[PDB]
Amino acid sequence: NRTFSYTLEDHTKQAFGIMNELRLSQQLCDVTLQVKYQDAPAAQFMAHKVVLASSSPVFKAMFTNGLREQGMEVVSIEGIHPKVMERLIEFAYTASISMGEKCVLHVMNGAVMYQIDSVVRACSDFLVQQLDPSNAIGIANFAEQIGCVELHQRAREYIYMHFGE
Amino acid sequence: HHHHHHSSGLYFQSMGNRTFSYTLEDHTKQAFGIMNELRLSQQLCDVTLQVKYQDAPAAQFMAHKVVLASSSPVFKAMFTNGLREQGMEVVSIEGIHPKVMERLIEFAYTASISMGEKCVLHVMNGAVMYQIDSVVRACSDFLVQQLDPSNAIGIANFAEQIGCVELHQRAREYIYMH
Ligand SMILES: *[C@H]1NC(S(=O)(=O)c2ccccc2C#N)=C(N2CCN(C)C(=O)[C@H]2C)S1
Numbered sequence: 001n002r003t004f005s006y007t008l009e010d011h012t013k014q015a016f017g018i019m020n021e022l023r024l025s026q027q028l029c030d031v032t033l034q035v036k037y038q039d040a041p042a043a044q045f046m047a048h049k050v051v052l053a054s055s056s057p058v059f060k061a062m063f064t065n066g067l068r069e070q071g072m073e074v075v076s077i078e079g080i081h082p083k084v085m086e087r088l089i090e091f092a093y094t095a096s097i098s099m100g101e102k103c104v105l106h107v108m109n110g111a112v113m114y115q116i117d118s119v120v121r122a123c124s125d126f127l128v129q130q131l132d133p134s135n136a137i138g139i140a141n142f143a144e145q146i147g148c149v150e151l152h153q154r155a156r157e158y159i160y161m162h163f164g165e
Numbered sequence: 166h167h168h169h170h171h172s173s174g175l176y177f178q179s180m181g182n183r184t185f186s187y188t189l190e191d192h193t194k195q196a197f198g199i200m201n202e203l204r205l206s207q208q209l210c211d212v213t214l215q216v217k218y219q220d221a222p223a224a225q226f227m228a229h230k231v232v233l234a235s236s237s238p239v240f241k242a243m244f245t246n247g248l249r250e251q252g253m254e255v256v257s258i259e260g261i262h263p264k265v266m267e268r269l270i271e272f273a274y275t276a277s278i279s280m281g282e283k284c285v286l287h288v289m290n291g292a293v294m295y296q297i298d299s300v301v302r303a304c305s306d307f308l309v310q311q312l313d314p315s316n317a318i319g320i321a322n323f324a325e326q327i328g329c330v331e332l333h334q335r336a337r338e339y340i341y342m343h
């Protein structure tokens with residue numbers, strides 16, 4: 001009651017905007033992600049360990065288990081398409097992800113790999129809404145491959161429903 | 166350079182091109198919460214601010230350059246003019262009391278600041294020095310709100326002395342009306 005208190009409602013959004021600009025300008029970056037998919041050319045993404053750690057338990061564990069200040073870390077990623085890694089990094093830096101429906105399985109795989117659970121769930125919910133007789137075997141199959149129990153179940157149930165099971 | 170190595174472990178003969186879009190509404194708030202935990206547990210920090218103020222015990226504040234730059238054009242210029250790949254950098258700071266810098270770092274990491282009414286002048290001055298304009302503006306509106314005939318001149322002078330154009334102009338406009 002003799003205290004001055006102030007909260008800037010959209011501070012975290014504005015600050016994330018500037019951190020995103022610093023990423024795109026390759027300023028203050030302390031991690032290089034090297035992404036090699038099949039025969040596509042290797043892609044390279046600069047980022048900030050603290051931002052990746054703030055968005056992914058997997059990145060957090062890599063960088064904090066590291067129990068050493070050492071500057072530039074290099075993460076070599078195999079068998080994830082670069083565009084998938086671009087979409088996940090942009091998600092960590094912007095809170096948003098947008099893509100064609102054919103991209104969703106691939107992005108979901110990447111999201112599961114880095115335990116970005118909010119993206120995994122949004123991908124899951126979308127794919128459940130897309131279920132049809134043409135796609136439900138693929139979706140069940142993929143969902144089993146990447147360990148997505150809920151998507152695999154919803155896809156199995158949708159199939160068995162056609163047989164009154 | 167420390168190296169990490171990651172590996173990923175007819176069906177869609179019919180798929181359209183419906184657009185998937187997703188926004189996590191409180192992502193930036195949650196992420197800032199984790200980055201504040203990391204600061205307080207001294208994890209992934211790449212700067213130590215050594216803050217020395219005349220007749221004050223030396224303080225050290227560990228933080229992330231990219232988070233400080235995100236809230237302060239001054240921290241942004243200072244860190245982006247630094248050499249690349251330095252690991253931990255110790256940065257000597259003068260002209261600001263540790264308790265003021267501590268409140269400015271907390272604001273960068275939490276979006277909130279609170280202080281005794283009696284601190285507002287000092288905290289405004291610090292906010293001006295680090296160009297944390299949202300705190301400058303909040304301290305400004307609080308001082309405009311205290312404007313009376315006994316204090317208006319002092320507030321206009323204080324404004325001019327710490328170089329704050331809106332608070333100067335509003336204090337002058339308030340005096341003119343008389
Ligand atoms: C949406 N995204 C893409 S992609 O990013 O080009 C791609 C390519 C290969 C593997 C995964 C991803 C992702 N995400 C799409 N496609 C690009 C063109 N081709 C040949 C495809 O089969 C899709 C997956 S869809």
Ligand SMILES: *[C@H]1NC(S(=O)(=O)c2ccccc2C#N)=C(N2CCN(C)C(=O)[C@H]2C)S1
Binds near residue numbers: 264283287288
């Ligand atoms: C509220 N804050 C403080 S402070 O953080 O302790 C401090 C100390 C020195 C210089 C600036 C600031 C600030 N802000 C206050 N006071 C500390 C105790 N005394 C005696 C004071 O006169 C102020 C500056 S007010």
